[model samples]
Target: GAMNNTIINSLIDSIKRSNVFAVDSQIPTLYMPQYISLSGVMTNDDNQAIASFEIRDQYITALNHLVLSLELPEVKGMGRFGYVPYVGYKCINHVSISSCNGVIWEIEGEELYNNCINNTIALKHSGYSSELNDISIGLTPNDTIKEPSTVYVYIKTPFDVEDTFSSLKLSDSKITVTVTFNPVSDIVIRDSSFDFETFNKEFVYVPELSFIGYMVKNVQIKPSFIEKPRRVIGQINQPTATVTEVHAATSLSVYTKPYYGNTDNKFISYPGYSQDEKDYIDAYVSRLLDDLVIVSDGPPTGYPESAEIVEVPEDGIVSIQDADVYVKIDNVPDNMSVYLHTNLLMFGTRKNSFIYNISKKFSAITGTYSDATKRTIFAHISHSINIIDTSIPVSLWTSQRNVYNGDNRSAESKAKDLFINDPFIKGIDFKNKTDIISRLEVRFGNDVLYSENGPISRIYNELLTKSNNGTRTLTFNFTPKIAFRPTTITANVSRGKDKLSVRVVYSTMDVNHPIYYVQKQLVVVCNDLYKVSYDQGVSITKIM
Candidate 1:
């Protein structure tokens, strides 16, 4: 009653009518970014500190070159395409070229490889890399590279260089630079839906209480090589190249769609704007985001569903907004009298050196106050968030492993262990932090709890040291809601409880047969009501 019940009811009805739950999508995907470093010990091929094998300064020729060896694969970028348009491949993870073995004269962060790292993402390699990501040997006179000796270059990427690597080399040396093939693992939902329980009296053969979804094996726990993003962000200056003017004829109507009154919207930056003018652009973006609210809504019901978006025009909300989503906990408290938020903020002198400070929404996060805007937004759109359990179904008694099936050391335990051993975990040197141990906690069902925190390594060691046991009672899954949809059941609950007719219908992508509704009688022939519950005060007592 307290929520926007009308909207919630309408949304729920829409889901039922449109059969929303009768859908499955392979939409749960995440990307892990990591890099491989390529460094070797070889010099300029022609004994020149400068352009020894120069052919228009575009290639690395035949010679004994530095061959950086890679130990693993499973590199970072596969690609992010579509609206965000990411050609995850072909980008230099990062690079540092130190020539003449002179640590003193070093070209850092992607100079040699930056030019050749990319996809046909933008025009003129504009957004970071120059259009040509070609590999060159030496450094520009901005001067740090003094060659003729060995040149050490390191490259990190979320890509595998197995095939194209043949071209990324020298003739004599076989392979000059190398990117590693790292290890990787992916977790996915394989339609594992655990069924819940119910009591059957007709089949009262033995036990009074019934257990459902008893699994024979356990959840999986294996290693995955998902490296964390780096802390010390670095950059490489776009290479300054010699451009030869060439003429290639093309039709004007081919595709030069201009948006503005004249200048092709391209300002010849003879002179750029000052800081204030640049801030004006940021201000423009800030205003734009304020009015944008992308929404996901449920289906069509008899009662009209309110618009799925609420783009409030309030400066206070825009200024104080943080976090991606505004959460409304189930049975959550609505205490707006005295609110608290972190005082931390971003922008101006406080902004960090990185180009990306925060999302336009969370720039100045961490402070809370009396929120009329929060009240206003919630008032317009409060509903029971659709309860779609994305977890693959599992039998309650299922064990994480075959041999140690249905035991205490099932999926949860294995997850913790796998996490403890992952590269990023140890790479961060978790043992170095004593404070983290104080914050760890664990739980089983509603009662069993473990808040045993220690150094990360110690936690791992202690956790691995323990053994787990069994019980499907904890999963408590009984009478799970049907996942597939448009199912119709026809039966008299009181009379034909056993030989009841059941039908499971489904909607699909095809236009001709949009709905596949089938009907079958699902009869449950009970032996007896061996177990029953004495109901009172909204609770019941089990019967044997």
Candidate 2:
């Protein structure tokens, strides 16, 4: 429709003429004020030209003041408390000045009045006057013989005249006024934990898998006499293993002394056992060493002379090198048992050798060599095992399938094409596209096959407009709601000699070029083999 300005103008004119009588009634209550002439027009026939001026007549009105009053009797038990007043109060807003000790009056309407009395006496000398002034009045109970009870009040009025007014005044009226007192206190409680800071540190390392060797060197000693046979003295070598690996083979045991009470002379407390305590205990030193295979210089020796158990301290770490055992196998004859030494010196020497070997191996593997070093050789070894286990099967599968090609073929298209070409698909309207490919209706050649109802029919109809692009991948989620038993299905199959099969047709559309191309078959399958049922039920079906 072309916009014709002439026709629009004519219609607008007709509407304006018809609504002309509604000008005053139709005028909006709240509207932008029109500009009016501020100066009167002046014209001098021969000497001057006419001059005029304009100004905006719009003005804003201020908000009205609200007056709140409370009689003395009404405020009983709240005697002369802080007369707190709030402005622009809102439900969710907080009060800035909760309470204040002062009387305030807000004049609202065209006029205001105030009257007060104290102890049955007029508050001001000019009684019943409609005038505002600073007048103070005090009240004292009639009984002077008793304790003096007094009250004070101040009054305010809107008028400035000293004359009798018909307005209500508290002076002539009999009334009872009560006062209330409120105490103010401030107290605050805060939680320190809310301000606490958190800190975290991450530790990552790879461990080794192999064990350390114990044999240092095999020494051979020639027999001194001709009659004596040749003998060998093999020096025991310290184990060669990384610190991480050594820790894996070692365990610690800890024990705490019982506390004794001086008054009772009895044990009061025993050591508590935690996971950390179990990890670093000193009593399990023997068990940790037994788990390790020890090698020495002697020929298949039972026990070395320098080997002995040592006690470790309750606190701090205990390394394998700190063991009190040392086996001297070189001097012992073949097939003979030898007693191991349990002295501190022999244990210290052997321990030092073990520690030295561990340090050397750790430095070689980790690249960082320092006095204090911990390696994760065991972790690395575990990772290596997992990598080998996982990669082996995948590698074998890849080799068998030759899946290393550049093109990664998806199985969805194959399944779709197979299903569509099947005997069951003959009755279905199959729409094939790269994005959304599915069977719409069931038809045998040109004849209608099966019809859907309810939500299924609506869902199928909606699926017809579906479109897909070549860049996107297609997926087939097959859900079978029925199951067939082997024996039960065999009888039905025998009745129907024609075996069911499926086939899929493929086509591609170039959206930009508006061209359609027929590609390879998408999928094909049998009708009898593919059973359909409600979503709640189940059957066996392959989904890609």
User: Which candidate gets the maximum lDDT versus the true structure?
Assistant: 1
- Give the TM-scores of the predictions, in the order they appear: 0.15, 0.11
Q: Candidate 2, residues 142-231: lDDT per residue as tens digits?
A: 212112111222222211111111111111112111111111100000111111111001111111111111111221211110000011
Tell me how far the alpha carbon of residue 283 in candidate 2 is from the true structure, in angstroms, after superposition. 64
Candidate 1 ranges beyond 4 A from true positions: 1-109, 116-173, 180-544
TM-score, predicted candidate 2 vs. hidden true structure: 0.11
Kindly list the per-residue Cα lDDT of model 1 for residues 1-544, writing each as its tens digit. Answer: 7779888988572344555567766742132222222223323222311211111111222111222221211111111101000111112122322122111111212222322223233212221221111111222323221111111222232112221211111111222122221111100000111110111111111101100111112222121111111111111111111101111101000000011221111110100111122333343232222212221122211211211222222232333333333322122224322111211111221123221112222322122222344421212222121101100011211212212121122122222111000111110111111121123222222222233323343334335434121000111112212221111212233442322111111112121110111111111111111111112101111111
Query: What are the RMSD figures for all models against the true structure?
Result: 34.9, 44.9
Candidate with best TM-score: 1
